[PDB]
Amino acid sequence: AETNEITIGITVTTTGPAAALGIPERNALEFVAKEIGGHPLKVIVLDDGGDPTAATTNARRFVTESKADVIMGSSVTPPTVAVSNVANEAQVPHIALAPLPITPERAKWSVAMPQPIPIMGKVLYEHMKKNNIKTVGYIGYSDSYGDLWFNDLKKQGEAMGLKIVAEERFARPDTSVAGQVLKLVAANPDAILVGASGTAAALPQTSLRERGYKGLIYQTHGAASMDFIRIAGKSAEGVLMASGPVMDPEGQDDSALTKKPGLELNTAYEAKYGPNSRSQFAAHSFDAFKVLERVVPVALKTAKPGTQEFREAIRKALVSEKDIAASQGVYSFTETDRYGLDDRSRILLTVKDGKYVMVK
Numbered sequence: 001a002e003t004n005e006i007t008i009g010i011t012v013t014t015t016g017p018a019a020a021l022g023i024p025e026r027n028a029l030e031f032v033a034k035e036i037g038g039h040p041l042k043v044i045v046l047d048d049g050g051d052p053t054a055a056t057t058n059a060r061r062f063v064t065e066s067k068a069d070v071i072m073g074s075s076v077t078p079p080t081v082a083v084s085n086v087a088n089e090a091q092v093p094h095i096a097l098a099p100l101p102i103t104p105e106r107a108k109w110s111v112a113m114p115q116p117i118p119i120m121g122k123v124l125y126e127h128m129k130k131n132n133i134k135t136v137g138y139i140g141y142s143d144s145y146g147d148l149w150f151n152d153l154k155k156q157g158e159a160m161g162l163k164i165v166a167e168e169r170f171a172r173p174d175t176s177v178a179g180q181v182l183k184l185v186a187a188n189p190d191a192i193l194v195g196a197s198g199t200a201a202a203l204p205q206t207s208l209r210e211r212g213y214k215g216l217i218y219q220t221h222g223a224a225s226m227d228f229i230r231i232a233g234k235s236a237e238g239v240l241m242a243s244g245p246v247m248d249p250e251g252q253d254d255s256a257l258t259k260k261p262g263l264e265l266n267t268a269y270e271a272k273y274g275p276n277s278r279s280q281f282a283a284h285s286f287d288a289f290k291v292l293e294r295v296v297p298v299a300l301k302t303a304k305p306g307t308q309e310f311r312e313a314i315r316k317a318l319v320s321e322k323d324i325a326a327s328q329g330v331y332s333f334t335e336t337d338r339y340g341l342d343d344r345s346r347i348l349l350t351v352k353d354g355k356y357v358m359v360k
């Protein structure tokens, strides 16, 4: 029944349009702890292609075939909702690697590593209101992720002095946004917020600049990898982008709790995969293990791996262990706050000379 190993199942997106998010998540697993408390970690990684059906199947294989103590994933919101559904039914701790709406139905067994949308929205809107932005347009996905961002722009953003003059949506698989851009450019808001991720985030970037949009463009943390710059090229110049601090540990003070783990991950990842290969996404899987390094020893005091008692002790340890330092933030979860993050979890980036720079 009980085991020596601690069993962790991970479903991420390493094929399909979101592969650029999952590949680094999987690769970061080379750099995480092999053991916690003397107990070897048995880590089982699967691709879900970003599909909720595959992520549901993967999560179930972990909780039932592997008897996992913890499950992690996925890379994008729709499959992450699916994993949460499974985790909460099976009563297994779930560490999400994409923001998701953490409803009362999902909250008991799920926490999230990515910064919550309102923290990222605030940093972007604050900048807007320092840069003479009065009117704003939105272009984002026609699904839960695009909704969370739009709703935040409407609730938080408007309350900061923004007037929404245009709202357009597109689906993840689309390779053109020409019609939506036509309306947006026509409305000529002072700024446009793009609610998308990966290669799709670069699409409105290029397409708006080539249509002659001159306003400020703002990107979510779903865009925070070099892939965006790769894909957007010269059109990325001057973008403002919400990011976790892992994108610039060098720019942090030594007093920042996030600095050490950011330097650790980035040194390791960039030694194998090359300079400036750091990402938002690699950091979420890395940080999930930093959380495990705090909560697993607590659980090990009172429960044996491979048992429900251990899963329950992990659940309780997630909310008893405070100020968990990781590359993307300092986490303090509660029964009700399943993200656990504050201002230490974000910085604002721009692109100059084809590289990300921290906006001071």
Ligand SMILES: O=C(O)C(=O)Cc1ccc(O)cc1
Binding pocket: 021, 075, 076, 077, 078, 097, 098, 099, 114, 115, 145, 196, 197, 221, 222, 223, 280
């Ligand atoms: O595309 C989606 O659904 C996402 O959830 C993307 C995403 C993933 C991780 C982040 O830290 C921020 C955004």
Ligand SMILES: [Cl-]
Binding pocket: 294, 323, 324, 325
């Ligand atoms: Cl810690």
